[PDB]
Paper text:
Using a suite of thirty environmentally-isolated coliphages, we demonstrate multi-layered and robust phage protection provided by a plasmid-encoded defence island that expresses both a type I [name] system and the novel [name]-family type IV DNA modification-dependent restriction enzyme, [name]. The [name] protein contains DUF262 and DUF1524 domains, and shares 13% amino acid sequence identity with the single polypeptide type IV restriction enzyme [name]. Here, we have shown that [name] is a promiscuous enzyme that uses a range of nucleotide and metal co-factors to recognise and cleave DNA that contains any of at least three different modifications, and this activity is dependent on the initial nucleotide-driven dissociation of [name] dimers, and subsequent nucleotide hydrolysis. Our [name] structures are the first for the [name] family, providing the highest resolution detail for the widespread DUF262 and DUF1524 domains.
Whilst using the first [name] structure to analyse datasets from a range of [name] crystals, a second dimeric structure with a differing conformation of [name] was solved, this time to 2.85 Å. Our models described above for DNA-binding and dimer dissociation rely upon a great deal of flexibility. By aligning the two solved structures, domain movements were visualised within the [name] dimer. The overall alignment provides an RMSD of 3.85 Å, indicating a poor average superposition. By aligning the lower resolution structure through one C-terminal domain of the higher resolution protomer, (which as independent domains aligned well at 0.58 Å), distinct relative movements of each of the other domains of the lower resolution structure can be observed. In this manner, we can see a 10 Å movement of the protomeric N-terminal domain, and corresponding shifts of 12 and 26 Å for the N-terminal and C-terminal domains of the second protomer, respectively. This level of movement confirms the flexibility of the [name] dimer, and gives rise to an hypothesis that the 21 Å cleft might widen to accommodate a substrate DNA, with backbone phosphates supported by loops of the DUF1524 domain, as was seen for the observed sulphate and chloride ions. The structures reveal how nucleotide binding is blocked in the dimer form and reveals inherent flexibility that would allow for cycles of dimer separation.
Author numbering:
A (entry chain B): 3 to 25, 32 to 125, 130 to 144, 148 to 163, 167 to 517, 523 to 580
B (entry chain A): 1 to 25, 32 to 112, 117 to 161, 163 to 258, 264 to 579
Amino acid sequence: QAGGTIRSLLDKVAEQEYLLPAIRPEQICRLFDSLLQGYPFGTFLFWKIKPENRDSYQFYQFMQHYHERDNYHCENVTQLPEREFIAVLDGQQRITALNIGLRGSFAWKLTGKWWSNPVRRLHLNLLSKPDLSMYDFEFLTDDKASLDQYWFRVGRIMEEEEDALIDEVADDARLSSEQRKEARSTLRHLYRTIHDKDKISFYEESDQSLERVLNIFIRMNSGGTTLSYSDLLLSIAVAQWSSLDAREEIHALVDEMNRVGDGFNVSKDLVLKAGLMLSDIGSVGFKVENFNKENMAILEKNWTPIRDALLLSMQLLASFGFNAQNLRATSAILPLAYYLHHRKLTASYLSRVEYAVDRECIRNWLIRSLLKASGIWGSGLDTLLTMLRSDIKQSGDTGFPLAKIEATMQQRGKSLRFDPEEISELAQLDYGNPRTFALLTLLFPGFDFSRHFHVDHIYPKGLFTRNKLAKVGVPAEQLDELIEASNKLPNLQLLEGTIQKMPHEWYAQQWPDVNARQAHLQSQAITSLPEQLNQFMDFYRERQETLLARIRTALQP
Amino acid sequence: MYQAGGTIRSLLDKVAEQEYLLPAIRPEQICRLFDSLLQGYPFGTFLFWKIKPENRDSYQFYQFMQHYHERDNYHCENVTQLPEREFIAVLDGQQRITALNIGLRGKLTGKWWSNDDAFPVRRLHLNLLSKPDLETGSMYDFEFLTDDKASDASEQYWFRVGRIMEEEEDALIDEVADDARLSSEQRKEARSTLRHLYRTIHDKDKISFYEESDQSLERVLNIFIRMNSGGTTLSYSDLLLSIAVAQAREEIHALVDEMNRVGDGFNVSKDLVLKAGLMLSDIGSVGFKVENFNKENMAILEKNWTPIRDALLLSMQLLASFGFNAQNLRATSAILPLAYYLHHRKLTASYLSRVEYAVDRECIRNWLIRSLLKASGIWGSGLDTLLTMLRSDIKQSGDTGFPLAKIEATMQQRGKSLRFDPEEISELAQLDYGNPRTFALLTLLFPGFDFSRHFHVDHIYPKGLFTRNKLAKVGVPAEQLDELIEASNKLPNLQLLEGTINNQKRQKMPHEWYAQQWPDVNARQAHLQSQAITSLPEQLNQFMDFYRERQETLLARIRTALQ
Ligand SMILES: [Cl-]
């Protein structure tokens, strides 16, 4: 146990003496800042395998070079060490983070534009300046760090000797006198922390008594680790209620809400934030300051109406057929739940046709809010929720105020008016985008979303395989130029009911009536259906031009 | 602020001064911590919350526990005196400080009414002549003892760890020195130990903490979790040693969930499946240790996987055919022997319907119920060894069926006997509504019942009629009151009722519900005589006359059914 060095540990990892029994870049950079800032590491748990049990278990190596496509699974042990070896039971991620940073690489898929066709390594600015962080660490590509901020690869601390690196900086003339001075202090801090410092601590033990020492660690070190601000806040908040049955009631509603229809995944966090919003509390932040005794008193005095409304909220989203896979913005339920609370609406709201227009007004808003790439439900959300809540109080007594909510949102910069580019992106959306279902719900508003339904390909994806298209006679150049489009909105439609024929056959053995067939089709924006698969592209580009103009109109206010 | 420095005396002294508080609400466990403390094992970093007096009256803080009383103080007391200056609310380390506090600063019949003889005050003690117990792996002996059980074992000198905080070092080192009860050489050993304690509670920096304000709790919290435990440490997840060697995580979770949904419900753990793995795959060692989870052992397990998966499910269903649920089967470690029997004989759901297995299922149930009625450790200690021997018995007798004869005798040799002692019999007749053992006793004493169809335990005389005030209308001595209301929950007022909660009976008194729902004189007479009800008083005043008469009727059946 006692103490130890990061260099010592990283090297036993390399010699494969430190292993792993079975089992975010920016976050690795954050460990390294905290480390160089002197935030100490906690104690780690280690298991020493007797040489007799060397073959008894299947150990795996830590990750050094990460590639989401190439190496993403912890590689198995290559050469079983010839002597005593250790397997880590706690601190795996902490160790892996140091390994990737000082001896490895990280390749993550770049977020590209919607038109789509990189091994980076850890670097530190020696002329690091603080940011209200203290030390700027970034995973960068070599050419992006050669930028004419003096960037240094932290990895060389493990490959070169201090004297060489200290000297390179001093012999660099791109740097002025005062600069080289700062750079040296910083480079030294790094070398003198990865090397020459007692940061690692480790409870170690053998097979027989491993049972006892894991439990000592759990008593002495933490048990039931804080789920961040979240379980803390819940803990803090529940501790200001008369009912010592409060903790449960929240978890209970969360469960009921997540079994409303086909299924949802809200968090206790949403319930707490909703509580604040519905209680007309002036701040809606998820902060312990806002979960005081006075604030939580209001919630406890109004819990039953608030719970009911949030449940009806999910019931309404499922009336519009949302589930855990298509609704990604749980933050959008909050305005809706304030509305059902302001008007004290009940389950009857979903049935009475008298409220049908208002339900379709809400859906218009929700869909358009979720169709925006991003910017509506992310940053600045707390100011928005506040101003949206306000709108509902001043003019919701009549009905949902879309006119006002639309412009309040424009003012906070979060307009729901789509640009020609945002519209062009929406017309090439892929099958998997959660935004796809909802675009179709808007474009095709007549459906019983309240009942089972799904999204399918007019021309089935099965036929879209390189051989099959070529058997029919598609230029080899156009192969794989169609298979990609087979999964794009112009070949996507909304169908009634749960989940082998070309569309024009299914549509003539299921739509015998010429007049009714022509209608279902024009209603699904299917203007024509060509019989040779080698004419699908003329179809695709035709439906798109039709849908593009239908998307513009449907998002015009 | 990261105070790496800090002593236990300082913490506890700030705890007593009500400056260290809590925002939100077992002895042996506390005792294990104290041994490890003196074994040098350090504490983890704690997280503390600074409260400026501008927000002092806004969050309802609570004190740590010191003198615990299941009946009186079982919840952290509210703040008696709020401090005027800045103060702290612990977020991490809540339990660890609450073990030091109670440690250095403070029954079985569960006759809840009795204040006396029913809540003995025990305080932490240490044997200064402690010695290595290579079984527990302990090197220091800490037990919670009462003053009498603390005062002449030749090698046990008990020191109340509490005086360390009230007396002076010199004084205690002197008391041990001027104690003629001790022997010269053994006086030296005591001193060395007493010193380590005084010098660990004081004079040694063991407490470490992060004191943070509201402004930046979010950030430093996150920083703490990065550098410290974020994966909530771990568990004895030997399941990993197998998803690895075997070529699974899903299958286990599946058996667990399916087994937990068989009847009205069960709450089994992944642990049982794995333990049954070794039990049913004939591995000579059933320990949940990592040693038996070897590549070659886990080879037999995946071959017997389909065979065991079924038996564990068949086991759970047999239990639900006996009315068992999460609420009434706390000792889930008793399923393991049952599963071996089903696997040995390769039975199926047809064991649950075919009348040819009735005598057999009833032999099993009797044993199971009897095993659970004992409040001692038939399924608490020496399990790996009992289970190992039961396996042998079941394997050598899987013909006529359950070797109950042999199983009882092997349990008797291992001291896990099921012959009931007269005193233990008497407490079974006084079992409360809550003790899960009660459900079973009723099913053992009333073996003719539809355990199959939905059923609930109810009270002959309804619980709602027993309110201090309600009994004054009928006129009862207020002398025996908080005890009469307790008897409303004991066995003589408890019965097995078919169906579910009948709100229509809670209102009526027994002679007003049986009298109508059972109109035939001959039928009622029997439904009742079968539920051990000889007479049913109609004046609530005579309840205690009914209780004693039934207790005598039930005591009779208990002695007949056991023994
Ligand atoms: Cl914000």
